[PDB]
Amino acid sequence: IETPITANFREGLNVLQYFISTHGARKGLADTALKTANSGYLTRRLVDVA
Amino acid sequence: IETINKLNRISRQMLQEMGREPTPEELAERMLMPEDKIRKVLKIAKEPISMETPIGDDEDSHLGDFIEDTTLELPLDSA
Amino acid sequence: VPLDGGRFATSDLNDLYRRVINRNNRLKRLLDLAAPDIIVRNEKRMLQEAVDALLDNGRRGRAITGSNKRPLKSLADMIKGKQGRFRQNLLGKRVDYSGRSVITVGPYLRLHQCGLPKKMALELFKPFIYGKLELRGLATTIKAAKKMVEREEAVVWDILDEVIREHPVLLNRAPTLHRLGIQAFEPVLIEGKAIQLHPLVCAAYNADFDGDQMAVHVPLTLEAQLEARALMMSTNNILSPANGEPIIVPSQDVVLGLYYMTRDCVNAKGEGMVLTGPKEAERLYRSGLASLHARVKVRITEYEKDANGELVAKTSLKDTTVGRAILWMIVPKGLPYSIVNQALGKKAISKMLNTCYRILGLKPTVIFADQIMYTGFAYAARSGASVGIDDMVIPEKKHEIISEAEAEVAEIQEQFQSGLVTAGERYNKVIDIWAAANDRVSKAMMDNLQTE
Amino acid sequence: VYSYTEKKRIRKDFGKRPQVLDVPYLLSIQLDSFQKFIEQDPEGQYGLEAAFRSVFPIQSYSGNSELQYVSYRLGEPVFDVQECQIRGVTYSAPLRVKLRLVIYEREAPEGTVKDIKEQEVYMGEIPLMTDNGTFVINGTERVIVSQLHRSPGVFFDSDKGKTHSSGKVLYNARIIPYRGSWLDFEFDPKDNLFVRIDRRRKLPATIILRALNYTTEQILDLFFEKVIFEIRDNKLQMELVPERLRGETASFDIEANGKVYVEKGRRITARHIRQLEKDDVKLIEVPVEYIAGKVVAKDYIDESTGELICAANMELSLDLLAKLSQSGHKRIETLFTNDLDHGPYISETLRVDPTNDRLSALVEIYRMMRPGEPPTREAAESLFENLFFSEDRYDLSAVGRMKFNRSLLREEIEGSGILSKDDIIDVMKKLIDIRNGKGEVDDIDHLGNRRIRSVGEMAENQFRVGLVRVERAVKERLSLGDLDTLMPQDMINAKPISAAVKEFFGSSQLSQFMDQNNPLSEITHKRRISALGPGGLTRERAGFEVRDVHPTHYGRVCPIETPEGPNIGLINSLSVYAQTNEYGFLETPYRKVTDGVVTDEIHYLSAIEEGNYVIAQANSNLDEEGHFVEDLVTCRSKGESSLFSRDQVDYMDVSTQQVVSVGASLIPFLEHDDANRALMGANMQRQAVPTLRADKPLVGTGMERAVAVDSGVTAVAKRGGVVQYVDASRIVIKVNEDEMYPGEAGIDIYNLTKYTRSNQNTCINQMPCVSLGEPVERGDVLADGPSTDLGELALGQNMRVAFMPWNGYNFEDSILVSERVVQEDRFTTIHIQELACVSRDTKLGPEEITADIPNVGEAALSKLDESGIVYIGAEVTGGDILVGKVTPKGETQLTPEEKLLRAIFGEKASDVKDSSLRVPNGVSGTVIDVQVFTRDGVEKDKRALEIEEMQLKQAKKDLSEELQILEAGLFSRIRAVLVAGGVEAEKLDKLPRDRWLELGLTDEEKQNQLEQLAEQYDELKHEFEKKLEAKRRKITQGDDLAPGVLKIVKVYLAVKRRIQPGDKMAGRHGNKGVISKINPIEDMPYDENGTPVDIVLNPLGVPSRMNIGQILETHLGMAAKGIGDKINAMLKQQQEVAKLREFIQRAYDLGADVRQKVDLSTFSDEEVMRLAENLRKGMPIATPVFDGAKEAEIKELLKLGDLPTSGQIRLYDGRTGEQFERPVTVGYMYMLKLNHLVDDKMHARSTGSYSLVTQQPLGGKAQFGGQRFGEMEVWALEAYGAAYTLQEMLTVKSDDVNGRTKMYKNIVDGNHQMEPGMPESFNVLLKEIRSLGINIELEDE
């Protein structure tokens, strides 16, 4: 969606963009929390036959 | 089993009438039984605990832990 | 088994094998008398359900409930599911002699040792200091050696120091997703209750210094002693198979201080003066009348490999600095001058280690990497970097960028009322305009941070 | 204006936005849940009375007797919260319920006057709430966590993505009950409608309609719109509404009172349907082939004979129209069919479903319910009435009924507990309208679709379960037999209700332990909202899109508060100002703005009222006297931002400080940091342990005053007064007579108890800090808790960070500390422990406690008492006897070598075992206090006498002091009587106090006054002797102990836990690392004054870990401590108070756009001196969240402290003495000490006890164990050239008994051989394989 951030971390940002950035932060945290199980089962698959 | 059921019914009636815990001294004064016999009957009657008993939320904490076998003695005593 | 509180610990298998024999005896009592056939078939399929539940309970739609309001676990569930008798006790299980503690930053040593603490070395090398103490004759029996090791005299620590030397002990970190997580080093007597680790080889562990308490595993037998000796030391397995580049290359304070240490700039305080000897150059730098980034003419003695293992000394006039001359004094008898004649940064230290490991040797490469991390730890503390609010800057271009951006957004809002702007065209226009604005911010920030 | 605690010391708050009314009471969520549950309701549709109206009255199967209910009441608790904190026996309150028995007559149908009885029947226990907020259960304080479930409502969902990959959009309808069968309506990809009543197998749509005694024509009249076709003797003419030919190709010539309108083959356009609407054509001549092929609605019977010519749901043909024309039925009412817009799909369902009547429907429904039964009518009809039309067995949640009426767009917010026949028709009509494309699919993640399960609602659910668990047996006892001599007291039991209550409060996964580290984490664990529970959001089927935050959580739920890992952000916590309504939803206040004039009144808005209109945000510029500044003000329109004019702004928030919770908003610089490390800050602070003696922090917020006294850790004054006596164990107060109670004199004596135990092993002190008596009022601070200094929270203390690189020690996010932290006991935490003793009766001899223990020397017995107990404060060492204990031994059976040794040396070795209490690997320390429980039948035997006199010293002596305080006023009243009675001034002080009643005056009113004074003294003595007996009675009877156990001795410890050179401790922004070894003050750098650097951090951690708040936090701390050092330098000279007054006035007026004008000119000189003694260690700063200090203020505030606007002044080297090439900031910032202590997690084993199956070498915390390895380490060791060291780890040190037996003999003799034998776990595997009944063997080599 349209409007980006205007300031930066040094000048100080507002409440609205800070609420928007949580949607991208915690989704990436959920991705890096959940993808490790599939990666581990795949690297289980590759060493399993061997 | 009959004596345990009788003592359970008397304890339930006594907790209903009085309103507090069934102290066994009044049971011994009522049913003319000795107090050590009441202690023995209250001590024997207990259901055993199963071998799984899920404690935590994860499927890692179950039994086969915190229980040790005392038949296997120390290697230092054998040495 | 009776518990400490007098409670009893029985299994559900006891309940299954009790009810099966109970209804088997009840079937015997029904078949020894004249029973109706409905009762006989009832007892038979109850026996059938009980035997097939004792074999495997709870893989069909209905199971046995009413033990402790949980669904019942049978004998096949020890093997089949996540509980896993195989996975728990057959291809890996609980073993004696181990320990784990918080990792602690200290170089403190050469690369073949990493900081094992005092009390864990006392606890885990305890039968060893029974065995090497009873033989030498400082105690009568081992029962007296019990008391002599819990009283903890200084001769016990002396025998323990005799035991610990020449003993590589295994260290692993969970999970071991690659093979470089497990490797052995020999201990040293330090003070404290925390383990330490060699800071240069932390790329092989994939671990940050915050905790996680990696474990230590002790080998006992002499064949396990030689297995921990030969193919466990990190000098013996230095390069990984997966990539075309080794993973004992640093990217740290070492690299930051080395990039500050090899950088040059034209400034004052003795530039362009000629000396013969890089040791004279570093002595003149340590005397105080010099500059770290100055242009100093030092005669560099350059060596070159022969066809079958000799060297040719070539000393001429080379354009170098103070720090490049010191780094030339770091390397013993090796790589040509074109290696040191560039701005040594991220990829350059990997190129130096890659040429050093491939051309010249193994043990001078280990010594060379050890001297690199030594001089990195030296000139990092010599550097002394800092971050302030006046270090990072934001120019006055950002107000003009925001003004032009809101002017173009106002132009979009004026052209939206014409009736020929859809949602997708306006969406693509907003993406293109703000992407060009972000690229203009990035180029302005690059052009304003590379200058000044 | 302000409180006296703020008159003592005050800080600077900038405040760029003006504020309105502050943070409310923090624990209003947990307390009101109960206050709506226990407190009595006059209307009675709340709390327990809702369950007592839903269940009661109970009517038996015979109908000759019933049970009635009136009300309930609560009694006084037996034990207090302090005695239940010390010992702890089920802190609750008994429930009293009066019941009436109504017995009907046999002859009279309504003979209710036969037998009416009234008595008392006991119910059980109900635990009250310590108003501080802890469920006190048997000495272990807990709470319960509020849940977050989907609640009763009718919202829809889409079925796309994975299933139905052909490209068919399918929806479903889900009716959510409260207690019954969960109703499911779904679609079919071949254009049908399915019904899944309590989903196990699919059912058609019309079977539930035909089960309600409905015919075909009633369904076609209610759902479909019917069109009448008319015939006048040659033609086919229809009554067509003209707005119905949209999207239909005309295949004939339309001639209606004029010319041809629509050509043959042209679709009906806009002007054609406009002209057909303008003409108002009633009859349209349609051809034969248009009607022939449609479906009629009614059953057109024959008027000649009465047979069925055509039935319902029958396709028309060419001969059928001729038969209907010859029969005379010229009112063919054909159903309107529009495949594009409308839905004929229920007619297709009628085509598929072959059932006709209710008897054909109920058989199939009852076979779908329970297969394996012959079909009946009465049982299926009763099952239908009890599953769908019942109230006692099927509740429907009146708030959920309001949600039903909101979703179905009705006007009545009340309803019944049964499902009406119109609701199913309305929800099917809504589902057909959504299938047609007129509706909208509601998302799951709305806040109007989740209901808060608080304490009282879950208590109502558990009370309903426990009452259904009794009422069946109550009905059985009513229908059991005789009713004349049978009383209702012995009928209703008390065991199952109280048993279910105590098992839910001590066995549920939500009812867990608390966290006594620091009280902000206590508030966090109080107002925590979980998602897992009784059928809630299970993490195995966790919502992948539910886990992402919804844009309507702006101001309701804190977006960042969760622990990383398995407990992912599904479990959250609510925000600061947001509370809950009585319905069960979240709400937040907004202030009123009327036509640009910003007023003062505020109102609360629900979840569905946010996305309708304009909601403004707080960072917009506001002007004086109401109006705005800028024409373009950003706001929130339906969850999206917009830029518009002035008059469209409806509401506005009060201030920014609300979108995060309290644990995030205590960080003052959250607006300059990334969201990831701000998420990490919450679970960095909520596991922090405070030090021994901390000080006042520097960088805080203004909301530290709330979480303080509003948490409840500090002692709150009841109504104020003058402090009379100050001690470190007890403080009292003298209340003024104006605010005194009119009954008698009230004295608030404070029996504060220090150093109590916690289950996280922490030390708690409440630190009496008050001076001699000052006038205090309501809402003051009298006791600073374990993490508070002067009311507000003092969590940790500030260091001096100079993040500069060092020789390999600050390598990758590690910490260098100095040697000055050890000297003044800085960073010193105290961890205390709790132990216990067991003594159980055996069959050969009971357990005894004697100091005389055989085979133990007197050097280990000198520390014990004559009973065998360690003295209080004795320094213990690992391997000492804590509690002496003898044990009767049986028969001695030993080897003949030891019997030969016994025959040679000559020790008898009698039957006394050494089973005394010893500490395994004992961590040394100091015993706090020994608590010993006694037995009612066994004599206590001399031990607990001293603690009995200690319990008598905390007894009546304090009541004697209160009696002396009352006796002072009593003697003052006696003196006021004796002066007013006669002239007595010199003959009263010389006489003793007891020789006053023998004086006899004249017969007048003063004799009656003296008689009343004597009766008042006798009444005070009679009141004193009652609790004189009662306290001793409570100490005597308060010894309930577990059966089979004689007595239990508790032993406490105190380690004081000095600084180990490797720990886990960091700052507030989430840079967690490990402290390396301690370098001294000599190596570490210093400054021009000569002070060495206290602590060193990571210099490259700043641009890589994206933390910005660290730098300006360091600058604020440096500038504030420079101001404090200037205050100290002014204090060093005996200076005139006027220029100090001017200095404090200019320091408070330093801000340009600052609020909170300090009333500073009204302080006295001693108050200014106390303010200087408080601001000695720096003037603390307070910056609010999302409102920060601009850098010009930082520059002009550190220029005040004689700094050249850089903060980097000349770090000198400590090793060589030279100066650095570029200086580093030597400023001050604030950091906290964590809970991860080193040797509590560190453990290592050599030997021990082995387990049963595969001998399972035990491990864990306080178990003397080690670490195993998984199959990952097996693959890692097989990746090397190592072969059988892994095999050694597999068998030799793991399960080979003879293997390790030979191995230990090889090590103790110096052989070092392995000799592998046979693994026992593989033998256990072979026995588990052979337990099935199939063969397995080992082929011999």
mmCIF file of N, CA and C in Angstrom, chain C residues 4-5 75 89 93-96 98-100 103 105-107 123 176 179 182 193 199 208-210 213 223 227 231 252-253 260 377 380-382 385-387, chain D residues 803 805 807-812 840 1058 1060 1072 1074 1100 1221-1223 1242 1245 1250 1257 1259 1264 1266-1268 1272-1273 1280 1282 1284 1289-1290 1294 1314 1321 1328:
data_model
loop_
_atom_site.group_PDB
_atom_site.id
_atom_site.type_symbol
_atom_site.label_atom_id
_atom_site.label_comp_id
_atom_site.label_asym_id
_atom_site.label_seq_id
_atom_site.Cartn_x
_atom_site.Cartn_y
_atom_site.Cartn_z
ATOM 1 N N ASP C 4 8.744 -41.867 47.144
ATOM 2 C CA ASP C 4 9.214 -41.295 48.402
ATOM 3 C C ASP C 4 8.054 -40.863 49.292
ATOM 4 N N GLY C 5 6.899 -40.582 48.692
ATOM 5 C CA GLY C 5 5.730 -40.187 49.451
ATOM 6 C C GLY C 5 4.802 -41.344 49.756
ATOM 7 N N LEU C 75 1.364 -50.949 24.422
ATOM 8 C CA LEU C 75 2.736 -51.405 24.244
ATOM 9 C C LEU C 75 3.292 -51.075 22.865
ATOM 10 N N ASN C 89 16.239 -44.819 23.130
ATOM 11 C CA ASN C 89 17.239 -45.638 23.803
ATOM 12 C C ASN C 89 17.953 -46.651 22.910
ATOM 13 N N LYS C 93 21.260 -42.437 23.421
ATOM 14 C CA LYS C 93 20.680 -42.576 24.750
ATOM 15 C C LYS C 93 21.572 -41.840 25.740
ATOM 16 N N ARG C 94 21.249 -41.963 27.026
ATOM 17 C CA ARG C 94 21.975 -41.215 28.044
ATOM 18 C C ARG C 94 23.267 -41.929 28.421
ATOM 19 N N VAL C 95 24.361 -41.167 28.361
ATOM 20 C CA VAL C 95 25.701 -41.648 28.677
ATOM 21 C C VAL C 95 26.361 -40.834 29.792
ATOM 22 N N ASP C 96 27.228 -41.492 30.556
ATOM 23 C CA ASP C 96 27.962 -40.883 31.667
ATOM 24 C C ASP C 96 29.153 -40.027 31.235
ATOM 25 N N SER C 98 30.042 -36.113 31.523
ATOM 26 C CA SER C 98 29.782 -34.966 30.661
ATOM 27 C C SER C 98 29.577 -33.699 31.481
ATOM 28 N N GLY C 99 29.262 -32.599 30.811
ATOM 29 C CA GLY C 99 29.023 -31.340 31.491
ATOM 30 C C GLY C 99 28.862 -30.219 30.479
ATOM 31 N N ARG C 100 28.153 -29.175 30.906
ATOM 32 C CA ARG C 100 27.932 -28.012 30.053
ATOM 33 C C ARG C 100 27.876 -26.736 30.884
ATOM 34 N N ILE C 103 29.581 -20.323 27.704
ATOM 35 C CA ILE C 103 30.800 -19.959 26.991
ATOM 36 C C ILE C 103 31.210 -18.545 27.385
ATOM 37 N N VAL C 105 34.158 -15.313 26.575
ATOM 38 C CA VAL C 105 35.097 -14.793 25.590
ATOM 39 C C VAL C 105 36.468 -14.583 26.215
ATOM 40 N N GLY C 106 37.440 -15.374 25.773
ATOM 41 C CA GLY C 106 38.832 -15.066 25.992
ATOM 42 C C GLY C 106 39.709 -15.814 25.012
ATOM 43 N N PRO C 107 40.565 -15.087 24.270
ATOM 44 C CA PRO C 107 41.555 -15.766 23.420
ATOM 45 C C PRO C 107 42.557 -16.558 24.241
ATOM 46 N N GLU C 123 35.749 -32.592 38.730
ATOM 47 C CA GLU C 123 34.677 -33.577 38.815
ATOM 48 C C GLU C 123 34.800 -34.670 37.760
ATOM 49 N N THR C 176 23.878 -30.259 16.147
ATOM 50 C CA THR C 176 25.019 -30.411 15.253
ATOM 51 C C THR C 176 24.564 -30.594 13.812
ATOM 52 N N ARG C 179 29.264 -30.876 10.589
ATOM 53 C CA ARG C 179 30.209 -31.726 11.306
ATOM 54 C C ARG C 179 31.212 -30.928 12.131
ATOM 55 N N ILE C 182 31.344 -30.545 16.355
ATOM 56 C CA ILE C 182 32.081 -31.431 17.250
ATOM 57 C C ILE C 182 33.553 -31.433 16.852
ATOM 58 N N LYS C 193 33.724 -20.706 36.962
ATOM 59 C CA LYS C 193 32.809 -21.821 36.736
ATOM 60 C C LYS C 193 32.134 -21.728 35.373
ATOM 61 N N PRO C 199 38.076 -17.769 19.925
ATOM 62 C CA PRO C 199 37.189 -16.831 19.211
ATOM 63 C C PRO C 199 37.330 -16.854 17.697
ATOM 64 N N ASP C 208 26.563 -17.451 18.562
ATOM 65 C CA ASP C 208 26.862 -16.129 19.091
ATOM 66 C C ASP C 208 27.112 -16.222 20.591
ATOM 67 N N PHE C 209 27.880 -15.275 21.126
ATOM 68 C CA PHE C 209 28.215 -15.305 22.544
ATOM 69 C C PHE C 209 27.073 -14.770 23.395
ATOM 70 N N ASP C 210 26.049 -15.597 23.601
ATOM 71 C CA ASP C 210 24.937 -15.236 24.470
ATOM 72 C C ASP C 210 24.595 -16.340 25.464
ATOM 73 N N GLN C 213 24.861 -22.986 26.363
ATOM 74 C CA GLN C 213 25.533 -23.982 27.202
ATOM 75 C C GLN C 213 25.890 -25.292 26.502
ATOM 76 N N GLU C 223 42.367 -45.976 22.584
ATOM 77 C CA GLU C 223 41.929 -45.834 21.200
ATOM 78 C C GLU C 223 41.024 -44.619 21.024
ATOM 79 N N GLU C 227 41.729 -41.308 18.787
ATOM 80 C CA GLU C 227 40.679 -40.789 17.914
ATOM 81 C C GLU C 227 40.381 -39.324 18.219
ATOM 82 N N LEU C 231 41.986 -37.115 14.325
ATOM 83 C CA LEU C 231 40.946 -36.537 13.469
ATOM 84 C C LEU C 231 39.879 -35.778 14.258
ATOM 85 N N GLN C 252 35.009 -9.866 11.555
ATOM 86 C CA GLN C 252 34.853 -9.420 12.938
ATOM 87 C C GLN C 252 35.620 -8.134 13.214
ATOM 88 N N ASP C 253 35.840 -7.866 14.505
ATOM 89 C CA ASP C 253 36.711 -6.803 14.995
ATOM 90 C C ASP C 253 38.128 -6.926 14.444
ATOM 91 N N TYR C 260 41.315 -0.790 9.256
ATOM 92 C CA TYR C 260 41.806 0.489 9.761
ATOM 93 C C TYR C 260 43.332 0.539 9.790
ATOM 94 N N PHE C 377 43.654 -8.561 17.036
ATOM 95 C CA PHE C 377 43.311 -8.215 18.413
ATOM 96 C C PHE C 377 44.183 -7.088 18.957
ATOM 97 N N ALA C 380 42.989 -3.752 16.769
ATOM 98 C CA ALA C 380 41.619 -3.372 17.085
ATOM 99 C C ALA C 380 41.579 -2.511 18.341
ATOM 100 N N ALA C 381 42.273 -2.950 19.397
ATOM 101 C CA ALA C 381 42.358 -2.151 20.615
ATOM 102 C C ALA C 381 43.204 -0.901 20.402
ATOM 103 N N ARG C 382 44.142 -0.950 19.454
ATOM 104 C CA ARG C 382 44.884 0.254 19.089
ATOM 105 C C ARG C 382 43.993 1.239 18.334
ATOM 106 N N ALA C 385 37.372 2.428 17.852
ATOM 107 C CA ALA C 385 36.270 2.998 17.093
ATOM 108 C C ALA C 385 35.125 3.406 18.020
ATOM 109 N N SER C 386 34.229 4.250 17.505
ATOM 110 C CA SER C 386 33.083 4.735 18.267
ATOM 111 C C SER C 386 31.942 5.146 17.342
ATOM 112 N N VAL C 387 30.715 5.152 17.863
ATOM 113 C CA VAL C 387 29.529 5.538 17.102
ATOM 114 C C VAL C 387 28.792 6.624 17.875
ATOM 115 N N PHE D 803 31.796 1.938 24.792
ATOM 116 C CA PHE D 803 31.861 0.848 23.818
ATOM 117 C C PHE D 803 33.018 1.117 22.856
ATOM 118 N N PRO D 805 36.711 -1.044 21.191
ATOM 119 C CA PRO D 805 37.298 -2.374 21.011
ATOM 120 C C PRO D 805 38.515 -2.609 21.902
ATOM 121 N N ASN D 807 41.469 -5.978 23.306
ATOM 122 C CA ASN D 807 42.293 -7.080 22.810
ATOM 123 C C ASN D 807 41.562 -8.421 22.934
ATOM 124 N N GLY D 808 40.609 -8.628 22.026
ATOM 125 C CA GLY D 808 39.932 -9.905 21.899
ATOM 126 C C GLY D 808 38.930 -10.243 22.976
ATOM 127 N N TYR D 809 38.651 -9.328 23.903
ATOM 128 C CA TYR D 809 37.719 -9.618 24.985
ATOM 129 C C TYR D 809 36.301 -9.145 24.695
ATOM 130 N N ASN D 810 36.138 -8.008 24.020
ATOM 131 C CA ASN D 810 34.828 -7.584 23.526
ATOM 132 C C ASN D 810 34.684 -7.984 22.055
ATOM 133 N N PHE D 811 34.696 -9.300 21.848
ATOM 134 C CA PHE D 811 34.822 -9.884 20.519
ATOM 135 C C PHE D 811 33.511 -9.844 19.745
ATOM 136 N N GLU D 812 32.486 -10.521 20.250
ATOM 137 C CA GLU D 812 31.180 -10.576 19.598
ATOM 138 C C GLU D 812 30.100 -10.455 20.670
ATOM 139 N N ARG D 840 7.792 -40.949 58.454
ATOM 140 C CA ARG D 840 6.626 -41.785 58.222
ATOM 141 C C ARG D 840 6.695 -43.050 59.067
ATOM 142 N N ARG D 1058 27.531 -14.287 45.092
ATOM 143 C CA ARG D 1058 28.528 -13.329 44.628
ATOM 144 C C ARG D 1058 28.766 -13.457 43.123
ATOM 145 N N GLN D 1060 30.083 -14.211 39.707
ATOM 146 C CA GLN D 1060 30.925 -15.148 38.989
ATOM 147 C C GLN D 1060 31.347 -14.517 37.662
ATOM 148 N N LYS D 1072 21.668 -9.279 24.405
ATOM 149 C CA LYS D 1072 22.021 -10.259 25.430
ATOM 150 C C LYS D 1072 23.385 -10.871 25.114
ATOM 151 N N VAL D 1074 27.449 -12.331 27.184
ATOM 152 C CA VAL D 1074 28.124 -12.940 28.324
ATOM 153 C C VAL D 1074 29.262 -12.038 28.779
ATOM 154 N N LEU D 1100 30.915 -2.367 17.421
ATOM 155 C CA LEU D 1100 30.260 -2.643 16.146
ATOM 156 C C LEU D 1100 28.860 -3.208 16.323
ATOM 157 N N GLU D 1221 43.459 7.748 19.284
ATOM 158 C CA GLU D 1221 43.454 8.526 18.050
ATOM 159 C C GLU D 1221 42.114 9.219 17.822
ATOM 160 N N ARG D 1222 41.024 8.551 18.190
ATOM 161 C CA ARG D 1222 39.701 9.155 18.102
ATOM 162 C C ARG D 1222 38.903 8.779 19.346
ATOM 163 N N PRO D 1223 38.349 9.754 20.062
ATOM 164 C CA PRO D 1223 37.748 9.487 21.371
ATOM 165 C C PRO D 1223 36.402 8.771 21.283
ATOM 166 N N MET D 1242 24.207 -25.135 35.478
ATOM 167 C CA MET D 1242 25.365 -25.994 35.290
ATOM 168 C C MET D 1242 25.328 -27.174 36.259
ATOM 169 N N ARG D 1245 27.890 -34.982 36.352
ATOM 170 C CA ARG D 1245 27.807 -36.192 37.155
ATOM 171 C C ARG D 1245 29.038 -37.069 36.965
ATOM 172 N N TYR D 1250 20.776 -45.768 39.129
ATOM 173 C CA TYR D 1250 20.302 -46.086 37.790
ATOM 174 C C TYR D 1250 18.837 -46.509 37.840
ATOM 175 N N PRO D 1257 20.433 -43.306 32.868
ATOM 176 C CA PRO D 1257 21.193 -42.436 33.788
ATOM 177 C C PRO D 1257 20.601 -41.041 33.953
ATOM 178 N N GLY D 1259 19.208 -37.283 34.861
ATOM 179 C CA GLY D 1259 19.752 -35.948 34.707
ATOM 180 C C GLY D 1259 18.734 -34.858 34.960
ATOM 181 N N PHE D 1264 22.034 -34.284 39.919
ATOM 182 C CA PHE D 1264 23.406 -34.740 39.687
ATOM 183 C C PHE D 1264 23.477 -35.559 38.402
ATOM 184 N N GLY D 1266 23.945 -35.578 33.702
ATOM 185 C CA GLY D 1266 24.736 -35.124 32.575
ATOM 186 C C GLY D 1266 23.913 -34.875 31.329
ATOM 187 N N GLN D 1267 24.544 -34.957 30.159
ATOM 188 C CA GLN D 1267 23.886 -34.679 28.890
ATOM 189 C C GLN D 1267 24.080 -35.841 27.927
ATOM 190 N N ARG D 1268 23.016 -36.181 27.210
ATOM 191 C CA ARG D 1268 23.073 -37.166 26.143
ATOM 192 C C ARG D 1268 23.290 -36.485 24.794
ATOM 193 N N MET D 1272 21.616 -36.528 15.594
ATOM 194 C CA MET D 1272 22.350 -35.488 14.884
ATOM 195 C C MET D 1272 23.835 -35.598 15.200
ATOM 196 N N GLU D 1273 24.158 -35.820 16.477
ATOM 197 C CA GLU D 1273 25.548 -36.037 16.864
ATOM 198 C C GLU D 1273 26.067 -37.375 16.354
ATOM 199 N N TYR D 1280 32.935 -37.943 10.375
ATOM 200 C CA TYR D 1280 34.386 -37.973 10.515
ATOM 201 C C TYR D 1280 34.961 -39.334 10.144
ATOM 202 N N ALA D 1282 36.083 -41.196 12.512
ATOM 203 C CA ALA D 1282 35.912 -41.937 13.754
ATOM 204 C C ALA D 1282 34.913 -43.067 13.544
ATOM 205 N N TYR D 1284 34.309 -46.141 16.195
ATOM 206 C CA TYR D 1284 33.688 -46.816 17.322
ATOM 207 C C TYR D 1284 33.833 -46.099 18.656
ATOM 208 N N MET D 1289 30.148 -44.735 23.120
ATOM 209 C CA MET D 1289 29.075 -43.900 23.658
ATOM 210 C C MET D 1289 27.719 -44.603 23.580
ATOM 211 N N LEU D 1290 27.550 -45.484 22.590
ATOM 212 C CA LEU D 1290 26.327 -46.268 22.455
ATOM 213 C C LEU D 1290 26.168 -47.309 23.557
ATOM 214 N N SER D 1294 26.919 -46.464 28.523
ATOM 215 C CA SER D 1294 25.478 -46.242 28.539
ATOM 216 C C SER D 1294 24.709 -47.375 29.209
ATOM 217 N N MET D 1314 38.669 -51.257 26.531
ATOM 218 C CA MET D 1314 37.236 -51.090 26.315
ATOM 219 C C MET D 1314 36.483 -52.393 26.562
ATOM 220 N N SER D 1321 19.956 -52.408 26.195
ATOM 221 C CA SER D 1321 18.792 -51.774 25.582
ATOM 222 C C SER D 1321 18.351 -52.526 24.334
ATOM 223 N N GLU D 1328 10.737 -56.647 23.853
ATOM 224 C CA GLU D 1328 9.527 -55.947 23.426
ATOM 225 C C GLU D 1328 9.043 -56.453 22.071
#
